[PDB]
């Protein structure tokens, strides 16, 4: 009998191939999905999302070769998420983005089939499991907040991020990044869609409660061009621009997307 045991976004190792190392891709709970709003059953019993970033302590920003991420002190309930569909408190650990080679693509989730120019993921782990390592092993371990990005009007709360991207151009670079306020990345409304799903990068584990916000945030084509100057490659290796680091929509199968808003 068969016996089973690096990935990227290129043609040879991109999403179409991930299922071969990570057969959970063949599952029923993969992300991202297309959000079909005809079929998204509004639900009144979904509560306001309580985004409590009162005391958020950013630490580092870094280029991991797939994306950039900003990490937070997650030792205390300094930045948490509760309400919406979540049973309990989920503490923020990091945020990262996915984006395109051009403005017409970059988002992971789609809405009635439209792709936005980038998507922001805020990654939270369920405090009752004690840390992110134990949480990552559970069906209700993680909660990701997804925020769409469209081009036009510059986003101010993002300039602090964008001003340092040239210090972390290549894979493995990092910097101290303190006193960054994540609330300056939220849009005004917090109406959301929710469904059970997965990480969108390997290992593609199916323990994620997805919360996608209806309202995108806007950013200047100058800001998102800064995203596009990052490299997938390391210093001294041939240049390969960090673009199109998004997984395409996966089939919803027997799941239903719920809405918080009519
Ligand atoms: N793209 S996503 O679905 O938001 C996604 C979220 C999380 C993960 N991996 C899990 C994970 C946990 C901790 C850190 B860290 O730097 O402290 C990074 C990644 C993989 C994909
Ligand atoms: Ni065996
Ligand atoms: Zn992500």
């Amino acid at each position: 009998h068969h016996h089973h045991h690096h990935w990227g976004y290129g043609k040879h190792n991109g999403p179409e191939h991930w299922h071969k190392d990570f057969p959970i891709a063949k599952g029923e709970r993969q992300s991202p999905v297309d959000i079909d709003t005809h079929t998204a059953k509004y639900d009144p019993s979904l509560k306001p999302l309580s985004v409590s970033y009162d005391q958020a302590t950013s630490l580092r920003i870094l280029n991991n070769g797939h994306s950039f991420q900003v990490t937070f002190d997650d030792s205390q309930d300094k930045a948490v998420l509760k309400g919406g569909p979540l049973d309990g408190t989920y503490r923020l650990l990091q945020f990262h983005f996915h984006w395109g080679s051009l403005d017409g693509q970059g988002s992971e989730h789609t809405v009635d089939k439209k792709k936005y120019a980038a998507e922001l993921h805020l990654v939270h782990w369920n405090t009752k499991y004690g840390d992110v390592d134990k949480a990552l092993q559970q069906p209700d371990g993680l909660a990701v907040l997804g925020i769409f990005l469209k081009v036009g009007s510059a986003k101010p709360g993002l300039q602090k991020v964008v001003d340092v991207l040239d210090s972390i151009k290549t894979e493995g670079k990092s910097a101290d990044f303190t006193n960054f306020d994540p609330r300056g990345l939220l849009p005004e409304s917090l109406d959301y869609w929710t469904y059970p799903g997965s990480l969108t990068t390997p290992p593609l584990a199916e323990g994620v409660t997805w919360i996608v916000l209806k309202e995108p945030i806007s950013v200047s084509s100058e800001q998102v061009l800064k995203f596009r100057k990052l490299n997938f490659n390391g210093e001294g290796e041939p240049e390969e621009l960090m673009v199109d680091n998004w997984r395409p929509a996966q089939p919803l199968k027997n799941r239903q997307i719920k809405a918080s808003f009519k």
Side-chain angles (χ1 to χ4, degrees), residues 24-30 138-139 197-199 203-208:
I24 196 61
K26 303 181 203 201
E28 315 302 311
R29 295 179 22 120
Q30 285 293 288
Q138 307 288 334
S198 88
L199 308 177
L204 299 177
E206 299 193 322
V208 175

Side-chain angles (χ1 to χ4, degrees), residues 75 77 79-113 115-179:
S75 72
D77 286 354
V80 322
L81 218 74
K82 59 197 163 187
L86 303 179
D87 308 300
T89 306
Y90 286 78
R91 193 181 294 168
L92 171 67
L93 174 49
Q94 58 103 320
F95 77 66
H96 61 273
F97 298 84
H98 303 274
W99 65 84
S101 50
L102 286 173
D103 280 16
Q105 60 195 46
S107 69
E108 296 217 302
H109 296 87
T110 56
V111 186
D112 292 335
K113 294 310 204 80
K115 301 176 188 168
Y116 288 102
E119 174 169 340
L120 160 66
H121 288 168
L122 297 119
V123 183
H124 305 76
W125 59 264
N126 186 349
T127 58
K128 94 210 196 193
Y129 290 125
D131 59 49
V132 68
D133 292 337
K134 305 166 180 55
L136 275 171
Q137 307 233 282
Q138 307 288 334
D140 55 350
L142 280 210
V144 185
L145 186 51
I147 289 175
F148 294 121
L149 272 74
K150 72 191 174 200
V151 159
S153 153
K155 186 75 161 180
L158 172 58
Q159 194 56 21
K160 197 172 145 33
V161 169
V162 163
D163 283 334
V164 297
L165 289 186
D166 62 293
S167 67
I168 61 151
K169 181 185 188 203
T170 52
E171 167 185 79
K173 282 226 199 322
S174 67
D176 304 309
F177 190 72
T178 51
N179 309 122

Side-chain angles (χ1 to χ4, degrees), residues 26-53:
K26 303 181 203 201
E28 315 302 311
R29 295 179 22 120
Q30 285 293 288
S31 295
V33 300
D34 178 67
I35 301 168
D36 176 83
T37 38
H38 283 99
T39 207
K41 291 304 117 264
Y42 169 81
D43 186 350
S45 61
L46 289 186
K47 310 157 47 49
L49 184 61
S50 158
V51 183
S52 193
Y53 294 168

